[PDB]
Amino acid sequence: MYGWWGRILRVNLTTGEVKVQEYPEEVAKKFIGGRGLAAWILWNEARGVEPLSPENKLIFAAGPFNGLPTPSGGKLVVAAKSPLTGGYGDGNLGTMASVHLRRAGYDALVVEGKAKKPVYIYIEDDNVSILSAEGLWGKTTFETERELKEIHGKNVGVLTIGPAGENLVKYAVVISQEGRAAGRPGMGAVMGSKKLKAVVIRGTKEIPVADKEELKKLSQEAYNEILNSPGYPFWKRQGTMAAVEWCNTNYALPTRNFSDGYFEFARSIDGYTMEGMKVQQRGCPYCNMPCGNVVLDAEGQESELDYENVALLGSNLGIGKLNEVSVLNRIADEMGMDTISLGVSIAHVMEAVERGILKEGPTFGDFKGAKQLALDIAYRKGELGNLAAEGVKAMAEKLGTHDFAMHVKGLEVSGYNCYIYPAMALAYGTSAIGAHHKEAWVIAWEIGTAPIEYKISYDPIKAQKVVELQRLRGGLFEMLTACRLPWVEVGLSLDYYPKLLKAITGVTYTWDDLYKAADRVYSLIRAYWVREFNGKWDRKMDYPPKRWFTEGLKSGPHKGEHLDEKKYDELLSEYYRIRGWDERGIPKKETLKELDLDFVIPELEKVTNLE
Amino acid sequence: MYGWWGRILRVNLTTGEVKVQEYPEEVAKKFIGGRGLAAWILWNEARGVEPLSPENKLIFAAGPFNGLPTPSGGKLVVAAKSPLTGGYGDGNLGTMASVHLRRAGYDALVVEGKAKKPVYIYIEDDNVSILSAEGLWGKTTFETERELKEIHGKNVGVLTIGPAGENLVKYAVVISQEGRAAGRPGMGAVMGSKKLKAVVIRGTKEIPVADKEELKKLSQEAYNEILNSPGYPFWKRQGTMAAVEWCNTNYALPTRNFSDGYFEFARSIDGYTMEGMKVQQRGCPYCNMPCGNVVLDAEGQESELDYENVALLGSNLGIGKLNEVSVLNRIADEMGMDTISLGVSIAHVMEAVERGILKEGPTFGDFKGAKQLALDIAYRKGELGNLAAEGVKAMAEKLGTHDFAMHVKGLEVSGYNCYIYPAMALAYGTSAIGAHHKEAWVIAWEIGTAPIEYKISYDPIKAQKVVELQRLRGGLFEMLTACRLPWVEVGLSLDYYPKLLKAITGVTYTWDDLYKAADRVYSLIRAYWVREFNGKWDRKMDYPPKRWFTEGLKSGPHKGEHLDEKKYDELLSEYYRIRGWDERGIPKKETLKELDLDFVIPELEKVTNLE
């Protein structure tokens, strides 16, 4: 067996039992890795479990690309049943832990149970142990990783959670190297519910490879294709930050709880303001086009900036100064919570406060009051902070404000306002983990321009586009698992991936093999959702926030414009038609059979009727 | 089996293998523990090994008294074939690591082999792992323990080495809780040769006790006896620091490399001075008469003072200010090196400079120069720091300065000058592990007074009092293992020890049983020494330094007075007669049998002729 090890590391924090599970090579070929392997595990071992209970499974999954020198192939998926959405959840993050876990001899690490006291998992090749992390509990993500490296060395990958993960904030995440995050859907809350403060990994093994020479040829070429791409220079300069100006110009910039797609102070928080505030640039393992742009915030501290971070904590909050948005950004990072869901919950609170619904709380443009709430959420302090720490869906039900609750399936909407973008909106509505642009960032295509550098329409081909993209971004790249930006941003030929896959594993994968493998994962995940919800499911699940229907842009040539229900409903049906799902968004027995997901039928039939 | 677990933890740094060896109940009954158990182990497992080679065994041996609430019973022994002496070496220190080791289900821990990189041993009950310490190597013992506690919490026992151990300074020791130390013969240099930086222990298990009620009552009774003894108030004030004045009053205070027994500036480095420089008081686990007195040094740094540290690093160096001696004290502690051997090796250099044998180096009184040499020794900087790091015996061989080399068997002499004290001289000459006062601090009885508050004679009864003292100090107390000071200083009845042992292990030990056990340990160790010295051995190995025979006190009414070789030789013969040894200091066959050491005879018989 090449590329894959065929081994999964298992740790039971309740019994302290540690073992290695071997899985069949055909499971490897079938799901490839990352989100593929993660969905397989959660389907079998996370049936009906309470998201914050010890029975839920915290999965750290890499793919055949990880552990090896591959173009930006230092990513890693973190999956578990989501405490926020209640369905399947996962996220991705770059980290040397990805490299170590795999050189250590594992394709994945599954964690179950819950320790009696704060602990952290230590892995050094075959030497794996559960140690006390009692002295760490309470410390930021930055400090925890720092102290751990001060004991074990620099040659390690470290995953940690901040006070927000410990306090179980629904959108808490897992951090690494003061900047990389993963698990918007509560993966950090799960890691916290298990009394797991961190994971430290070091691996020195040689990962078996089918064609060593071709792996080197391909990698060198792909690396050089990046270096020589026309978009490399501007990418190096602004990274994902270039989307601020791009979204504003196109009215896709979330402003004041997505009330508008235009922000008057966008200049004071864009890639050009960022550029003049930069003091350092970091990146993920094996990446030659780093985009972890570090600036200094209004308090002299370092903040690693990303577009979604700034849009959600900046324009979305009505804050027009980047060094102040940078302060909030850093907090989210050390407290260990999702910048996106955190910004949407705060933005939600500001609107509600302004509407007279909430009596105490910050308003838009209120940096200080926003900074106090971000911290109050991190430590669940007081009534207001504890509520917002539950997310907008939960918060909405309590405050009775479904009106301006920007989420889909329970996950807060990303940094793209879609009042006039059917495809991107469909993208958000159909995301396998909930509202996210992860799997399908189609607004760029739908518009015709890209940050690296209009008449609405619900054309059926858009649903086809959203599906093709999801195969690549929500499928291939999440199973490899490598970075999509090289391809997305600087245009690296995708033809490199099936070839690298064949060089590493020895197995030929055609593009159809991949779309199928990708579609298999999408349906299995959709099935997991349905089963967990006990059959209570239908198309509305796949609907975008209702605000994009009842109101429209508040300024610009498209003022007043929004999305149309009837036409969106058809776009979706078309989507379901392509995927092979009924008008409830549930996969059909024929489709599941097609994708080798037969074993899923008996389980779903017990909760609803299949077609 | 009660009291003892009959279990020994084995860690092989080389192969990483970790197991638990079960040892008989007669072996426990026979050797009781601590030093007893360590000698049995070293005899069998460290046969012909290089003290600094991977084959050497690093032992952390506890005893029936450890892990349980026994009066000042938080001690622990550290043993291994000595790098400085080449014979059996060991030390003792008070540390929570003594309690936690036993509460984890082990009587002792035996490290063997050598890690391929800086590592530390982690123990939490049955969970034992060899972790990376690459980020710790190079840091002071103080910093190492603080950092590990910041990770695993305060509720643990940590044992560490400083750069002196790391660099293999021959008199390198193991440190704990900033101040507590063990292993003068270079236990720290053995820990370092294994690339072992520390040991973190935590125990929660409940130890099997034959009579739980008796143990309680006996202990409650022992503590009160301590609390009410007349010497308690003063002991709380000066600890062992009261020995400076008393030693100066008796011409026993080592001054300028043992050149004299009186120091004109003894007052500014005495217990009353210390008393007015005290900012904190610490102690070992389970002791109600703490004696770790903390002063602020010349540099404002906390320093834990003990008589021996101040005597060999102060008056012995000719340094008369206590805040300056404390500085050298702290350095010893944080670098991980025995204050005694460090001070004697330095004084030796100082005397060597003054006499012009050495062209460079500090002189008596030169604090700045002594501090620099001390730091140069720990880091082995320069020809001088390097030579001095070898100890006076080796240094002397190099400089040809055998005349003022204050050691016996390679181990440097303690803080008691014996120009006119035949018993104490015999104590140093026969100390099992080489020159030390641990096993026989007879000088107080020989004078008729003690610090807690003269005619030279060689009465053969002096050889008896030494053996008697050794049975208790170098035996019982190193086997239990508990602190001897509550008995020595405040006078707690020695009758609690046989009853407590009985209440713990269930066995009834009579004082003759104990005297026999201690004697077994003594003949075994001598056996070890002779065997490892390849039969090359004679009575001179038990002789005190030449200086005390060919020179005398330089001041006071005893001016000019010294020791008579002939009359000492006679005292040694009485010692050998009592112990049942030949005129060569080697145990006699009938003696070995008598002590159940028959298995020693065939082995020694291979290197010399027995009697």
Ligand SMILES: O=C(O)CCCC(=O)O
């Ligand atoms: O700006 C973003 O958040 C998305 C970057 C492009 C991509 O999602 O691949």
Ligand SMILES: O=C(O)CCCC(=O)O
């Ligand atoms: O002052 C010392 O160093 C010795 C204290 C008494 C003893 O050794 O038991």
Ligand code: SF4
């Ligand atoms: S492009 Fe950015 S996110 Fe992707 S691997 Fe490189 S540094 Fe990481």
Ligand code: SF4
């Ligand atoms: S008397 Fe001193 S050395 Fe003995 S146990 Fe107490 S604090 Fe420790």
Ligand SMILES: [Ca+2]
């Ligand atoms: Ca980031």
Ligand SMILES: [Ca+2]
């Ligand atoms: Ca001390």
